[model samples]
Target chain A: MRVLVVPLPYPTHLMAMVPLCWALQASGHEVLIAAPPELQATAHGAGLTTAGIRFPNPAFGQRDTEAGRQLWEQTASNVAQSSLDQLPEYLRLAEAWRPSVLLVDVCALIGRVLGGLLDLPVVLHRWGVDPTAGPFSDRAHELLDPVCRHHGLTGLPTPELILDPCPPSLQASDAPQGAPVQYVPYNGSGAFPAWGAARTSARRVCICMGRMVLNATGPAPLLRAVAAATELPGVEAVIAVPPEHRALLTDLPDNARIAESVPLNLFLRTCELVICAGGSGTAFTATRLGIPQLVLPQYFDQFDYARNLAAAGAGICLPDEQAQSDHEQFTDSIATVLGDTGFAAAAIKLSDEITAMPHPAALVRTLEN
Target chain B: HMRVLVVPLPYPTHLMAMVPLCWALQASGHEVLIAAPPELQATAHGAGLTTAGIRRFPNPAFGQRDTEAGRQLWEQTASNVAQSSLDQLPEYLRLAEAWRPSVLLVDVCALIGRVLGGLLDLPVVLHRWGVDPTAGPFSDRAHELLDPVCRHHGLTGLPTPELILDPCPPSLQASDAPQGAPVQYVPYNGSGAFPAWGAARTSARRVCICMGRMVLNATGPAPLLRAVAAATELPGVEAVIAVPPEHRALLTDLPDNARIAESVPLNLFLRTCELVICAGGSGTAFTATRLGIPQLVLPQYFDQFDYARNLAAAGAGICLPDEQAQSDHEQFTDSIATVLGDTGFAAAAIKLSDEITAMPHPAALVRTLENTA
Candidate 1:
């Protein structure tokens, strides 16, 4: 069976879909991706066959240096949305390459509409935690409800075949009454290399926030707070600081290393624990890998993803403002997270659930049947 | 530094013609203003050109309307801009003057040439549409359309070619063009520089089937394939078709001889072509001439019919379209054989080439502004 994947033209969206395509390909199914022309190399790098569709997004146009300097925010946003008008070109492409089933990223509204028009079966892919059926924080329901409203979707469906990438023990759902939930581990960047046989003065901690928010929002306070906590004796933190905050690294404590541009998987594997911003990659990877975690929810979704980790006994959710300011308070929380044997035991128990879950490569059987 | 505003009545062809002109002016130390629809502002911006978006004259795509109704409606909305342009002329002039431009340059079709020039008290330069300045005279349309306005501006005789911005290659320009109009062989915008075909050890036998954007009404290259297969007897011929992106994909199981892609960026596609075939539109003729590729022009409608006559008269192109499905093939192959031969056709190519080299590059229109200043 041929599974056609259409990913959003940006990095985060493309990254999430890449593993799924890989899964489908590994399962011996034919997987083809239709994406922006600019992303041709990226798509090829992910090992998916690509079909170029010329819906010239303004973001894609930003690659042209001349247009980049000339466009102000308003004109840029206008051009960004004006890209929708170019959808006709994509529709034209669909007429040429007829596919059996379309796998679309959930945010791709236009892809959904086209799928409907062509009467093709569509499977929507999403990342992070699903709030409608999870052990969410009190704020989780509120945060997710608006996202649903924003998209005007009626929350995540408790479908018969739910391939929730998160472990079931970590999320609260009446799934025993419903279709069995399959926990497919998130396909993050490749794992980090082995530590040297020599140096072990301190334990390592990974700090990360999703890439876009790191740019649109600042990360100075979060980085400094994490660095201070790791300053305690025999503890090291590998902080994922934004490029802009690199200048402040010299002032950091001796044990904290300022790292940027290191792919997330390498950083996650080397770290003994994770500190800093709440996002799915670090939290989920650390828990399933049996590493303790402390999540600082910077933005709305961060709170939900972090809260899921805490409820699953996988991590502790630190209050955002206090996590940035009070070094002692932050250090105590990190130390407690590190020292808590019960929480670690619980996380290890959940890690068993994660390891037992079917791998993404099994998706071909599901798709074929 | 002088500022020059050159407004091409926005269409892909007009944009292609006018962009090189604007670039040349900017290169020679002048500010160039391109007035076009907002949709294409990005293309100009991508090229590092200064542009002001004039909303498209409130209209729908012609395909949505009836034929004569579409043409008249297009003219009314566009030519009707004469009034708004008249009202806006002072401010337009002041802005041009503030940029301290010496004069205004307008597309022949935009209908605001004299009005803007009069308002600015500057010489208005005109960019003629095709290789033949006289071709505009082959019909009464130019005179009929522009006469009242020309008379109102105290001018007459078909807006005498001040600067003929012919996109024609060095091979196909008419000999009688004014000495004042010198030509530059800059390829068209949106025209990809011809793909490097010389490197291929075994070249693909090529056939270019370019359908004009206006002929969306035509069933497209599918029907044209029958004629192509019959006319060019070859072992294998690949038909590189030109159509809008919207239509390129709707076509399926194209003749084994055909390849469906949005038009080859002509400048690029021309280099690979064994023969250039089209509806004798300015774009194809220009692409063929500049790239020195041979042409099989099938004149279907519009100015293409005139272009066919011109190319045939010049002896450099095969100008034949199927008026009836049963036309004699021997007579047609003779025309094809003639244009492809080395004697009269080659001489005609050189003669036409020399005539083209003599015309002005569109940028020379800046002189009109210089003269006014």
Candidate 2:
């Protein structure tokens, strides 16, 4: 059997598809991928058959001034500006790959449309946080995947399968019935070695800005300032320097170290605390691993995902623009997520629940069936 | 004068059924307003019923906007809409503050029936078109297919016959409903006249086949022609194919045994026909049983499951699965033909119809509303 893995063109998205592609390869199916040109190497690096499609990632539009109204508008307003473009790349890939099954990220409407056109079975996959609807949620039935109208899509092409990367307890509403959608956690490979060899004397604070942090125009500079403000006993900065800035960490505080593309679970496995962008990966994993985190959300979905996690009493947000404009509040929220044991304890509780969870890999049963 | 708010999913078939109810309410001296998609306002105005404003929810532009993609994306983000509307309930609650309806009547699709009840401090009543109410927990797929409106509010439990306005067969629903779930049978609004085939049902053992409203639109069952072929060969069975004018050509091979017409009124024909065979829809099953004719219900999608089960429970019909109906046309023919030719199932159907008719009519429903208000 053949499977076409359709993931968006982004770093985390590339990595997220890896374990699944490898798992399918292990299952003896031919695995191929269609992604953006820029991420071709990332897909190939993951040891899968890869192809390029024409997908343009919209630039992060807000000035990374602070986490405030401007950031929200830039991200929320994007959907208004961004739409699926008809590019020959997808048609070219479709002509070549002609896959039997399609596994796509929620934003990848291409996989859904092509799947419908080819009469192939599709597996819809979602990344990021699943927003929780409140007790007064009444318009629940309106929730469905949007289909393309240009070529006249007849709604979701009755997928033989659906894969949600979040859990049932986390989803806003109960999973729809037909075929139960699969739920997988975003926690990177579950087998990262614990920080056994690292010295325990220093109170290590892991400061990791996510891949898209650089896109935040001001994240690099604001993150630098936040690191400069904190001076807790034995405190250290663990910044994730992009591959381009390998040498910059050398002259930083003696307590700090720059790690490049380091597996987060491994890095945070040993650290006492983490200060990261409000991306689902870093914050959620921190909350899942029992480490307290201060979140500086950098994008649209991340804002809600981070805020909700904070509302759950697990972390604190130093919104991008707000952190830049209001240093005192930024410092205080940082202190709160870092110094408050109550917050740490809440994160620890979430970690306990997440740790005991069955590996989401088993959710593939819905698809393989 | 009582003012009734009849809310149905913003779809044409549902609107057709609901408009009659609205008109009936008006005929009985009540003011009726139907809440739905803003786009449907013109149609409602044409039908002489008022409209409710479109629901405005703050969501991703792809979802909240009224563009083509927005409409299409809204379908994909059903969970988002369900969640966003919950977030926007303060607005919905404010609307209820003014409408202050005596009772919030809704199609099961809107889902927020119970929430509207809570928001307004009023009674929430569920209206149905077909077999969905009966399938209940037996099928989880059936539950999620409902619009977020109901699921978000809560699942009270399955409904019971005593709580309903119309009589129902036991096969359609569980004898013991969960505490809050209630099942009430309201007769399908009897407004449209019987179709031509229905009027022409003169044979002693005539089988009327209704190709339901939208089936003519595009998604009509491909195997109906074959089912008719098989039924035609059975002893003493005359077949009449009732479809919209567009699909008359789909059934070309029937001899004197079958009549092809653009439309037929099933309610008028049910009195004459021995058995009715049709795709599972609320209209055919509800009307056939109303007239005490047994039926065979074939489902092509989710809504039919409820109608089929109800008809089965009433002993008024056999509910054939869509897969089986398409692949095993012989079985569909054999089962439907037996009911048409034999006495046992037909007798049970008639008895169930008697029970359904015996249930309280809308006159009492009117009284119930009057007293409650």
Candidate 3:
């Protein structure tokens, strides 16, 4: 069976979908990734085949009529970035490739429309701690109504299955629950550190500022952690930043050092604590590794990831005030998680929850049935 | 409740074959350790595994076999592995004894790892690198040589592994080869930022020309140069040589219809090709067969020769002897033409793929190894 994977065109979302893609390919099923050219390269990086087709962006200046504008206003920022304009190209490609199943992200409108039009077994997948399924589903239907009118689908069909990696405790109570497949971390573009797997004498604190935060705000936020770690003795900060900005992260204490970049999952096991700008990739990776985290959330959905982990008692999430300005609050929060055994226990329980769920290979086998 | 230790020879192909199995086990929440030479460690680590201990090691099969002694020694690669690999045996034992692997999954060519497993009293699983023509004879010779070493290591005998995991499909595999469970072959051909194959179309039928790992060594690029030359001889066939960037400077000029594929994996590159021409590397051959594309084989050595012979007997591909094909470029080009023109080869390729698809997946075989312990 040819499994066509549709992913949100970011590296993290594409990486999130990788383990299941590997599972499908390992099961003697052929998997072809269909995404924008950037993510097409990402798919190849993770060692998979691709049929690259970039989706057309939604039109500007309001093609939405008065009724459609009301629907858009209701769904407004909650809408996924994908458009229904690309559905014709999608249908033509589907006819060309002949995929047996559609492994789609929760946010792909083009993929959903194509899946609906083809009447395919759409196996819907989610990134960890879904904020999309409950509130977003109704709004999506309203937004996708015209798409169905132009096509054969009857008002956008629901997926045959949903594969959620979010543990029961972390996922919202109102969200759609499917088989809770284990979150197998497949962070692409990894190389083993020259220092190797063994940790140093000082306790290593793994920290990352995340890509979006670094792009918008620059390395200032990540650099803040260096001084914060200097306050505490025997705590070595392994600050992971890209090579270009790494030169700016100098004048470090003996306890603080720059880590050469590898995939976070490759070295997360060696870390005692994780501090990152809470992207889902970092949050879920830290969660699965059983390492407690201090989420200094910067942008959208990151706030929710930060909130969910905090509510679950597995981590501490700080708003921008403490995260950016006050070093005292930041240091104290890091010390709190490190000083207490309770946070570590809660984190390990979540890790256990992740392991106990059906694995990617096992979850993929059921699709044939 | 299992810790499976994997051992692969220094060669990249051995590690590549074992990756899908290791991937399945790790994703299943089983702890896996890959202890190999430093050169091969990154390849193992790239597949996402906990890795350690990279000693310097080399395979003699890939280098020049111009000497009569080297020719005989390289031809008996299993015996060569059994003899030369003893140096790493102490390190292997150190790793297995420290980590306490419940099961040992050793590449069939990593002869010393089998000894480590025996010394540890763990169930050793022999994993085939490819459609192994060296299977039964290699083990028989390896055991004969390894018996004294096993005695010194305080083991009674170098006992046969509890199971052998065969990745090659039965139709392409040798009939007289040892009985082992079938494993799904998930191709991991390494990665690089390759150009577009998606939605790019041409009126010409594309044929991929690759010499696998053997192209870069000893006789130095003749096989690839001639193979590409022969492939371009076909008037309508668009020949694409998947050569590495380093050796590509050696290839000066080519026909306009032919192009260079620097980094794309065969599983991805073959999607655009109507046919494949290779040195009968199982990774390349099986990848083509799985995609149901007809192949033409150019055999350089013994095991590759078996794959060519078996593939020819199956009628999925045409086989050309490398020594003879060196002089007769027309004969080699004609074989590619014959396979590309015939519908029977395409049908046979599809039938082989159907047989391969029927084999149990790595997840099932992971359970098999899990339960075997």
True contacts kept of each: 0.00, 0.00, 0.29
Q: After superposition, how far is residue A134 of candidate 3 from its true place, in Å?
A: 6.9
- Evaluated at residue A145, the lDDT of candidate 3 is 63
User: Which candidate gets the maximum DockQ versus the true structure?
Assistant: 3
Model-by-model lDDT, in order? 0.53, 0.53, 0.72
Give the candidates in order of DockQ, highest first: 3, 1, 2
Q: What is the CA-based DockQ of model 2?
A: 0.01
Estimate, for each residue in A278-339, the C-alpha lDDT of model 1 and write its tens digit.
Answer: 54555666666677777666542455566667877777876556445667767777777667
lDDT of 2 by residue, B1-373 (tens): 4656666666556664444345334433454556656555544544434455555111123212235544444344444434444564564565455455666666654544445565455666556543333232322322344333454455442221122222234446433322222223333322232232343446457887776646444455464765677668777877767776667767765678776643334543566788777766566666677567788866554445555656676566787755545457578768866686568777877786665555544333555655544
Tens digit per residue, CA lDDT, model 2, A177-226: 22222222232221122242254676667776654566554345435544
On DockQ, who's better, 1 or 2?
1
Displacement of residue B248 (Cα, Å) in model 2 is 69
In model 1 chain A, the worst 10-residue window by lDDT is A55-64
Indicate the residue-level lDDT of A10 in model 2. Answer: 73
Backbone clash count, each prediction separately: 14, 46, 0
